[PDB]
């Protein structure tokens with residue numbers, strides 16, 4: 142905990158010049174159109190534009206800790222809005238271009254955005270989610286569950302159980318939820334494209350999951366302002382704000398980014414909505 146390896150923190154930011162950025166997001170659109178099974182991998186960088194600091198960016202929680210300074214929050218977790226990137230990921234699932242979403246984020250924003258939980262792995266937990274120790278029943282709360290490290294919250298299971306409810310936030314020693322990890326691993330293996338958005342990919346095994354896509358000839362795109370552990374393994378590395386990348390990508394795919402109706406939980410993915418016909422690529 143005190144000595145925990147917090148990794149490479151505060152590496153320099155890289156900015157692809159506009160022409161190169163325009164060319165790479167078009168190439169990404171090409172890869173999404175070619176791909177049968179697209180898995181997205183999200184970390185703290187997709188929530189920075191809603192006021193939540195990341196961990197290893199220049200003003201990251203861990204980076205600021207290393208320099209004797211404090212990260213800064215411009216929102217509560219409760220008053221945080223899903224970013225353009227969050228809402229672009231909801232649409233891609235709706236139109237059938239996203240098979241599965243793997244996230245390391247505990248900020249609750251994917252769930253709250255209306256993203257279906259049966260297509261989401263929350264590898265590090267969710268600040269709004271408590272779980273019954275007895276029956277494993279999960280509750281998605283409108284406020285952050287007051288505890289972290291799989292501690293008793295003080296509330297009891299209401300299943301037609303009085304089981305102890307505990308937070309889902311892993312501490313350093315806690316291994317990943319077996320259900321979320323199994324499903325993240327299956328989706329990543331079966332993907333022919335994994336796209337990473339705002340994760341430095343430094344945490345095992347979360348950070349390694351995109352590499353599993355490379356097995357049997359999958360393609361790996363890394364979208365990140367900083368270098369990431371697996372940059373060498375990527376067919377495409379885009380250095381720019383994930384919101385700029387996802388808004389240009391949606392525009393290329395002929396999709397609107399949907400409006401956020403406020404906090405809404407969706408347990409189960411609906412049948413695919415209609416989407417634009419595919420371009421002639423070759």
Ligand SMILES: Nc1ncnc2c1ncn2[C@@H]1O[C@H](COP(=O)(O)OP(=O)(O)OC[C@H]2O[C@H](O)[C@H](O)[C@@H]2O)[C@@H](O)[C@H]1O
Nearest residue numbers: 184185186189195196197245339340341365366367382383
């Ligand atoms: N707007 C942005 N656009 C693009 N990249 C961005 C943006 N904002 C930040 N970044 C990049 O986004 C990256 C975010 O990297 P890290 O901060 O390591 O977050 P993680 O999710 O991978 O951390 C994994 C776990 O580690 C912890 O211990 C927890 O347990 C976490 O769950 C940076 O490299 C930024 O350059």
Ligand SMILES: CC(=O)Nc1ccsc1C(=O)O
Nearest residue numbers: 185193194195196202247248
């Ligand atoms: C970036 C982030 O999720 N930080 C976090 C998560 C739970 S408590 C906390 C913090 O920075 O205090």
Ligand SMILES: [Cl-]
Nearest residue numbers: 196202203289
């Ligand atoms: Cl923390």
Ligand SMILES: [Cl-]
Nearest residue numbers: 289290311312
């Ligand atoms: Cl913790």
Ligand SMILES: [Zn+2]
Nearest residue numbers: 273276298302
């Ligand atoms: Zn229960």
